[PDB]
From a paper:
To see how this inhibitor affects the structural features of PDE6, we first determined a high-resolution reconstruction of the cryo-EM structure for the PDE6 holoenzyme alone. The resulting 3.1 Å cryo-EM map shows that the overall structure of the PDE6 heterotetramer is in good agreement with the cryo-EM structure of the PDE6 holoenzyme determined by Gulati et al. By combining the improved cryo-EM map with ModelAngelo, a newly developed graph neural network-based approach for automated model building, we were able to assign residues to a previously unbuilt region of the PDE6γ subunit and present a more complete structural model of the PDE6 holoenzyme. Strong cryo-EM density for residues Pro55 to Met57 allowed for the identification of a new hydrogen bonding network between the glycine-rich region of PDE6γ (residues 55–62) and the dimerization interface of the adjacent PDE6 catalytic subunit. PDE6γ residues Phe50, Asp52, Pro55, and Thr62 form hydrogen bonds with PDEβ residues Glu249, Arg255, His258, and Asp252, respectively, through interactions both between side chains and with the polypeptide backbone. Notably, despite its intrinsically disordered nature, PDE6γ adopts a largely stable conformation and remains tightly associated with the PDE6αβ subunit core across all variability components. For the PDE6 heterotetramer, the first variability component resolves bending of the PDE6α GAF domains toward the PDE6β catalytic core, which is associated with destabilization of the “ponytail motif”. Our high-resolution structure of PDE6 holoenzyme revealed a detailed interaction network between the glycine-rich region of PDE6γ and the PDE6α/β dimerization interface. Our high-resolution structure reveals that PDEβ H258 makes a critical hydrogen bond with the peptide backbone of PDE6γ P55.
Phototransduction in retinal rods occurs when the G protein–coupled photoreceptor rhodopsin triggers the activation of phosphodiesterase 6 (PDE6) by GTP-bound alpha subunits of the G protein transducin (GαT). PDE6 consists of two highly similar but not identical subunits (PDE6α and PDE6β, Mr ∼100 kDa), each containing a catalytic site and two domains (GAFa and GAFb) that mediate a negative allosteric regulation by cGMP, together with two smaller (identical) subunits (PDE6γ, Mr ∼10 kDa) that are the binding sites for GTP-bound GαT (GαT·GTP). PDE6 is a 3′,5′-cyclic nucleotide phosphodiesterase and a member of a superfamily of enzymes that play critical roles in compartmentalizing cyclic nucleotide signaling and regulating many physiological processes. PDE6 is the most catalytically active PDE and is the only family member that has coevolved an autoinhibitory PDE6γ subunit, which enables G-protein–stimulated activation and completely prevents basal activity in the absence of GαT.
Numbering used by the authors:
A (entry chain B): 7 to 827
B (entry chain D): 11 to 38, 51 to 61, 77 to 86
C (entry chain C): 12 to 38, 51 to 61, 77 to 86
D (entry chain A): 7 to 822
Write the structure that this text describes.
Amino acid sequence: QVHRFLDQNPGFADQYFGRKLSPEDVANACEDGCPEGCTSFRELCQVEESAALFELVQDMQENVNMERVVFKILRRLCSILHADRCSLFMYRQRNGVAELATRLFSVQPDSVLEDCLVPPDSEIVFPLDIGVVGHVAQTKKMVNVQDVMECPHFSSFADELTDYVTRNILATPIMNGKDVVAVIMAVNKLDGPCFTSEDEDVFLKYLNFGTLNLKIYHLSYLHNCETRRGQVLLWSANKVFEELTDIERQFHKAFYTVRAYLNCDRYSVGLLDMTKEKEFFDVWPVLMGEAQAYSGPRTPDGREILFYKVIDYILHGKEDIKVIPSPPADHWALASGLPTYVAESGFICNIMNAPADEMFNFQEGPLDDSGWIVKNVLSMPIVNKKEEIVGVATFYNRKDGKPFDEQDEVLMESLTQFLGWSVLNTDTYDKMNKLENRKDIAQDMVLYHVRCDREEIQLILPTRERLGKEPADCEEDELGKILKEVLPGPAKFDIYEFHFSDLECTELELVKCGIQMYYELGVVRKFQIPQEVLVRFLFSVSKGYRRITYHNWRHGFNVAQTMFTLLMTGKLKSYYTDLEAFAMVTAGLCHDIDHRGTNNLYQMKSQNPLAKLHGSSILERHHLEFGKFLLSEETLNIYQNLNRRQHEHVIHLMDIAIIATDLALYFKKRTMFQKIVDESKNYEDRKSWVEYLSLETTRKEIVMAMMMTACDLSAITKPWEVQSKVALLVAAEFWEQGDLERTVLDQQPIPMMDRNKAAELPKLQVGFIDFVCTFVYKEFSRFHEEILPMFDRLQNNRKEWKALADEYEAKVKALEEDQKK
Amino acid sequence: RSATRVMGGPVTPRKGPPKFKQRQTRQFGDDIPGMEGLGELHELAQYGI
Amino acid sequence: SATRVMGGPVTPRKGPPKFKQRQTRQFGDDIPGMEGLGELHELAQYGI
Amino acid sequence: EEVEKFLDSNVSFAKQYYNLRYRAKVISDLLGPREAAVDFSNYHALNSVEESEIIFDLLRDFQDNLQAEKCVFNVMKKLCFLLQADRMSLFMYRARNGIAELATRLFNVHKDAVLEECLVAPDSEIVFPLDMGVVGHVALSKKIVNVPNTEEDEHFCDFVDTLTEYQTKNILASPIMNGKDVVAIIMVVNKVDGPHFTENDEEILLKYLNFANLIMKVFHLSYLHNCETRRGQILLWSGSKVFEELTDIERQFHKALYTVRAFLNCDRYSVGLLDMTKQKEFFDVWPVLMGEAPPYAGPRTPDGREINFYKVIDYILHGKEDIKVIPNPPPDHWALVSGLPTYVAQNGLICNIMNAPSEDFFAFQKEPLDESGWMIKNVLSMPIVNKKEEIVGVATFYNRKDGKPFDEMDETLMESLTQFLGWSVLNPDTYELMNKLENRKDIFQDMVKYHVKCDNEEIQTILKTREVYGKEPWECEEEELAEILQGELPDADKYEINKFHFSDLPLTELELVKCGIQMYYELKVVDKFHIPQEALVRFMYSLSKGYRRITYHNWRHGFNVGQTMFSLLVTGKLKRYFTDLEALAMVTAAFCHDIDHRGTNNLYQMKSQNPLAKLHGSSILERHHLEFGKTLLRDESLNIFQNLNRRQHEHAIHMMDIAIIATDLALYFKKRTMFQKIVDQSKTYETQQEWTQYMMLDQTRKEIVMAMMMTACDLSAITKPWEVQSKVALLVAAEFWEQGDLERTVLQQNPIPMMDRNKADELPKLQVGFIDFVCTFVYKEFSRFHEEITPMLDGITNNRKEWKALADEYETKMKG
Ligand SMILES: Nc1nc2c(ncn2[C@@H]2O[C@@H]3COP(=O)(O)O[C@H]3[C@H]2O)c(=O)[nH]1
Ligand SMILES: Nc1nc2c(ncn2[C@@H]2O[C@@H]3COP(=O)(O)O[C@H]3[C@H]2O)c(=O)[nH]1
Ligand SMILES: [Mg+2]
Ligand SMILES: [Mg+2]
Ligand SMILES: [Zn+2]
């Protein structure tokens, strides 16, 4: 009624308000003596505002609800600032571009939350540079446009869309750690021509509470998103590292396990072919014109895009995960065409309001019977470490109804990136499978080339002639009779004697002698060894040995023949059961199976695959592995009529036997054998020592190892007429290995291996006898007196070699003095 | 009725071709320090042992 | 200092330490859909 | 002036006008920096004006640069004034190893105090367990507690009272909550004027904790968000290095633990790797069992193996980054001397140590480990789990960068890191499995290569260098080898090597090897490409040995196919379209077309799930033959392509790959209309010269022609004269019957009548059907293509006629 007069007299108004108001008040006013706070109503206004902000703080403290608190703050700020209305603009980052979407619109001092809240489907998404609000967000500062007609940033999109006229605009960005949470905005100054600087100061200071509330909301959202990202990464890592599988299984496990942390109604994963090049019979139709070339879209790697399998994860309502092999182009995921574009470009596609999109033919409306409409889409390319797109993952309809923002983009990008790197696991798995299949094929080829064939077994088991049947058909008694009438007797060849020589017997005769040795031990009957299997296994062992100078089939029968003599003529079978003797003679046969003619040292120096697979005792472990694999074959498994415990003991005892043939291993454990031999002299008679030793396990293992290392060098303990010839073959093999060293490795061989130093062979043999064999054979002669001939023959051979070496030395000295001196 | 007088779509004042993000290739190997370290006899030598 | 402690953190009860149990509870074909993830008559008559 | 009466008459208008014109100024002043004007030197009841001033002062601290400690301390000063209080304090809620702890962060806060005299460093905090104290009772009850007398309380502890020389009579405490987790506890110690704290003070505390609740909520949320972000970054960065390549455990662990060195926020951490040898070899267990050496004494893992850190990687980060590796670290090592890694390996328990020098269980260093005075204060050591629950290593993280002891969030972060590392052992183990499997495959491939290679004693059966010159073949000159071969190799005219009616029945396998060598000599590809003649002979003998000794697909079939290819090139005059290199490669492919055939067709390989079927997908046996032949050609002693150029070698290998793969009937059936189109195109041209000139330039048509020639040669047995076909067909039927018997026995499936041994009398009918179906098209099209291949068509026609006669006789016999 007088408002204009109060305006024209600011001094009178200030004087009147500064008057001390009487204790009488108007309405409640929380009058704890508050009428005169330096002004008539400054005390009352202070009290009322303090109460209001305290209520706002109470609302903030429990059950954080940023919408309601921000709405109340805006409602009060509308009255304080005299603005016609206020609004709130949520900040989101889609596709790397900041966007400002409405969350509270047309807020008035007499409005309610329901009439001002903006649902996700009614958002006016202003980009970063298409409005004054965008300019505020970009500049990260307050903007006070006194008159907005001349503002170069103003956009009339919102006011035209909402049937409104905007004159003055005041806005500020809600700030949190250099991240714009939101942008409050007040428009249409109701009283004055524009918003004064005092109104600007009030806008800054009164918005600190809203700043705190939005900071809390943003921090909660960020913490939840980061927790979900950590959980999905950990769960994907757990399933990826569970085992080695293909792309499909690994991706399905990773994607299904983390379905709870994605908060998506639906998402589908499409898998692309990896065939870089088509084979010749597929290129022929295009070149010859019988078929047209593929002119469709291609990956950045110049690859055909063909989703060969799409895994569909439908999570809204009922969980009905589907797998679509060779999906049609009509598939609801592929029909939109977004996965194809993602494959073509390898981009990160974030689609808001999919039905309103123009580039992609998203479906018009309801997809399934439930009327689920695609609204927000985020598509991701799964790229391996080699920058190749393995597949495309697409997510639909975020469960909370909001579009996919930056946080969801990074959350799903971390998952897709982790799974893309996990393709190395699948590549390694498929290379494992390829290598295993190739090794199995090579093993089968070896088995064919080593196993005695159908025709070769008739040389030792003639049954198509004697009986007219194949060996697999004849009964055990028939084959036993055939072997008895075919196999040599124990006296035909002195297989029971330490002086056995193989220089006057054929290889077939050697195999027959091996079968006879098996029969002598009596292990064929008690263990029910299939006789045809025994003959086949021995022939296969004979074939498995190479055709090299020394380490051929003959050396490997002489190793096993010597062990047979040790067991039955040296009477060392007292400490060993029949099963142990059986498994111990078999290991004697597989002593040096597949020896390549080069020693263990050459394997390491030449960097053979053997040296990489084993490392220590290379060739011995290789022989053990080959023998065990050959025995694993059913047609050659003599250990097939054996108990599981018996078979395990046999195999175990074979491992010590074969490996102990290594000379380096023997040199490190011979003192233990010396101690064991010394224990024998402590006992009174042989019977007591037999009783004690036959029950010990480790001591029997040591004795068996030393028996191996004595049988290996048994060629020296042969009569001189045999040792002289055998040493020549040994020297020839070592000379061949030295020549191989000089040629391939370009290294000077040691004198024992040097073909040039052929005249030094007697001296080298004398040194070898004095160093290695002497200990073994002396200790064995001390242990068992029956092995004494194997020591006397060694001493005789040493004497002969010493005589030859002395003759060579005398010749060298005579040449040195008689002319050179 | 919504305070923004629009239903059924987040209408945008921007008319143009959509733009899409670039895949992050920030790497999100031996240059690591310490990488290098991670991976009577004469007669025996004479006789190839 | 406010708490009159200069050296280090001080607890009233001092006994043997208690230590955490390693976390194991939280972490195949049980997942659905993994089952599916992994002139002509005479042609078969002649081996092909 | 008369207006002054009007506002007095109705003061509602005055209130509204003050709101319209001065409310904004009042709010701006109140929310300005300013200061509270409440008299803090007295104890008057709080006026609504003073209450509003206090509220605004508390709201003044709600700035963007939220210093949680300072704002909460200001709230405590105001609460000390309001509550008639003497002192107040705060206890941060920290979660150590399962047992939650409450450590003092603000202490002895009074109305005239400052942050400097109330802030508590991590080295001055008083850690309190959940069980003892009114603080612990408040934390467990999660509710406000008022104690009117400490003497009658059952939880009150005098520890702080004795340690601070203070007496507490009345206690009022309340917890600060974020959701349902306790964040901090605000407690009061003494009522200045009164028996205790009344209900009014309890209401004041609840009213004024809202600001403190919000500030603590902001601080807690920020810390948790930072921790979770760091955990995510650690996981992703470590996965990047884990999936960078396939390496051993040491390299992968070093990469993962060095790439995330910034995210761990630790001054120092060390990782010790345990030995994985569960069982020691027999020669190592012998001395222990024999008394030579004493057995292992002490620290043992729960898995049962000995604790032996064979390699320790220590990452020093407080000053100069000093990443170091200690192979076989001694017990004197600063990381292992404390014994915490050994204890963790013994137990497998996550250990968080606060104030390590004060601990007595472990001998932590109490002297400066570094020259800068670095101290071990807080330690966190954890195992590396592994998928088999086998402790493979121990990761120990020393003093935190911020100085605070490790809490539950740090435990969770490092536990996620160590769990990922333990899960990421499948790749290190698979790396060793890869290496061993590849080495084993190489070993067995060398074994098969030896077993099929012609040895030096078998090459003398043909290359008789020893008995002619006395030298080994590798020593004799090329001219000498040529002379020996000319003396030894047969005559093409005498053996009908370049005829379509060649029969291998009266020839030995060695004779066929010599004939095959003569085939290469006739094409004049030896001198042109300088093929080592010794290598040629050795490779031919290796091909002879490589073919299995099965019924039909023995080496005689391969030599027959090679002879057919040679005759097609020479007698059929198909060499016009092909170069010398292409002819050489084609002949080599023909000889290697069925190398190492098992005797069972592709369907049997697929049905039995043979490793061949799992390796090769489409053409199993043909791809296997191609691979084996190329491996045989890769040997230096067998490589006849060694003297070829790189382009020539690649073209030959490609051409062989096309030829051998096309030998299968399935590929021929699909790609046989192309041959008809090519023949029609040939007949379009006027003179043979123009067609030949067109063909030598086009490559796809040449490839298709050779692909058809491969199948024409593979079925050439039918085109042979009747006296040969009658036996070859029986051999083929015998092999297919063997495969059918194998199917019936192993696969337990009924064989097709073609492979059914019982239906042996139906062989003529099946052969007639075979001729009508597969071979007739090929040979008719080839005869139309070249009139010189007409004898092949005549032979197949005659064989079909005689097979039809036999089938008709059989059918007539079945009538009755
Ligand atoms: N109807 C209405 N429009 C608003 C409101 N706040 C801002 N706008 C309008 O939304 C628009 C966003 O871009 P501008 O800032 O350039 O201009 C703004 C104003 O025109 C409001 O509270 N109510
Ligand atoms: N001198 C002093 N003692 C305190 C303070 N706050 C807590 N205390 C004491 O620390 C103690 C912890 O256990 P109680 O809760 O039973 O009792 C408590 C109080 O006696 C403080 O601010 N000053
Ligand atoms: Mg050996
Ligand atoms: Mg074939
Ligand atoms: Zn063939």
